[PDB]
Ligand binder design. Structure first.
Ligand SMILES: CC(=O)N[C@@H]1[C@@H](O)[C@H](O[C@@H]2O[C@H](CO)[C@@H](O[C@@H]3O[C@H](CO[C@H]4O[C@H](CO[C@H]5O[C@H](CO)[C@@H](O)[C@H](O)[C@@H]5O[C@H]5O[C@H](CO)[C@@H](O)[C@H](O)[C@@H]5O)[C@@H](O)[C@H](O[C@H]5O[C@H](CO)[C@@H](O)[C@H](O)[C@@H]5O)[C@@H]4O)[C@@H](O)[C@H](O[C@H]4O[C@H](CO)[C@@H](O)[C@H](O)[C@@H]4O[C@H]4O[C@H](CO)[C@@H](O)[C@H](O)[C@@H]4O[C@H]4O[C@H](CO)[C@@H](O)[C@H](O)[C@@H]4O)[C@@H]3O)[C@H](O)[C@H]2NC(C)=O)[C@@H](CO)O[C@H]1O
Ligand SMILES: OC[C@H]1O[C@H](O[C@@H]2[C@@H](O[C@@H]3[C@@H](O[C@@H]4[C@H](O)[C@H](O)O[C@H](CO)[C@H]4O)O[C@H](CO)[C@@H](O)[C@@H]3O)O[C@H](CO)[C@@H](O)[C@@H]2O)[C@@H](O)[C@@H](O)[C@@H]1O
Ligand code: MG
Lengths: 101, 101
């Protein structure tokens, strides 16, 4: 997994946002960033990769109305159930960019 | 917090990724995406927001060479220590975009 660096150049971190420029699979070069705020966690002073089971345990995601996200997710009993969450609660538009806050 | 849909339009969800076109503070629009895999999680079938603490308990982050992220983070005793994590562990280039796997 990961390894992004081998095919990216000119990466910068600022605050918690990583930005880098990376080879498109065939052809061009894209510059993109990802906010680490949500992939990294501090545990008693050490940076740890923070896990989430969303993708792994949920399915059929779809946007309802303007902000609601819907999916079906495995209950601890391995059963799929319906479920939704209002993306409006914490996804904000910060000067044109969607941001988790 | 949040309320992106008040000032964004033409939104979509593909897998766990959300895309939308949002108003810059004053001026035009920008179309960004945000990967929701590390932003919410599935608890016994119900979706919830995944909190984190990187932003609120570490400070002065820095890029170290190719892929190494460095910072100072707070410990269970309440003191800051240096700490690093190799971003190459789980940050991959996916066809020009940075993704967390
Ligand atoms: C310089 C000069 O010459 N000025 C002259 C003035 O006479 C006059 O000034 C104003 O210009 C503004 C600029 O556009 C006018 O339009 C807009 O309004 C606001 C202004 O932001 C300021 O207030 C923000 C807080 O607002 C809270 O309270 C007010 C009512 O009192 C309401 O709007 C809300 O209910 C809101 O409540 C929320 O906030 C509390 C905190 O107390 C929080 O606990 C709760 O969550 C609660 O829900 C404040 O946040 C903001 O900070 C900015 O100010 C400075 C920079 O100047 C920095 O310190 C900050 O970092 C930041 O830049 C101001 O103090 C503002 O909302 C508008 O900008 C938004 O929209 C853009 C897209 O269109 C987007 O790009 C921005 O990033 C921002 O987007 C956010 O909001 C939209 C919905 O509006 C949402 O869909 C997005 O997801 C995004 O979400 C965040 O938005 C707010 C905070 O920004 C939060 O509510 C959300 O939870 C979330 O965090 C824009 O500036 C303004 O009306 C006008 N005069 C006024 C207002 O009296 C101008 C005329 O324009 O003329 C000059 O001559
Ligand atoms: O160990 C890395 C981790 O993720 C790997 O997937 C990413 C991969 O990037 C892809 C890579 O493949 C290109 C295509 O196959 C193309 O058809 O062939 C060329 C060879 O000439 C490949 O470059 O490279 C492109 C551009 O460089 C990239 O856009 C693709 O997504 O490998 C890079 C290496 O840094 C990494 O960022 C990603 O991991 C995955 O394959 C696997 O090794 C791991 O799960
Ligand atoms: Mg997370």
């Amino acid at each position: 997994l990961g390894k992004f660096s081998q095919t990216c150049y000119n990466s910068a971190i600022q605050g918690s946002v990583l930005t880098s420029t990376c080879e498109r699979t065939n052809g061009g070069y894209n510059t993109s960033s990802i906010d680490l705020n949500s992939v990294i966690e501090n545990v008693d002073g050490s940076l740890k990769w923070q896990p989430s089971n969303f993708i792994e345990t949920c399915r059929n995601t779809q946007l309802a109305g303007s902000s609601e996200l819907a999916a079906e997710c495995k209950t601890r009993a391995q059963q799929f159930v319906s479920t939704k969450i209002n993306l409006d609660d914490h996804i904000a538009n910060i000067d044109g960019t969607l941001k988790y806050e």
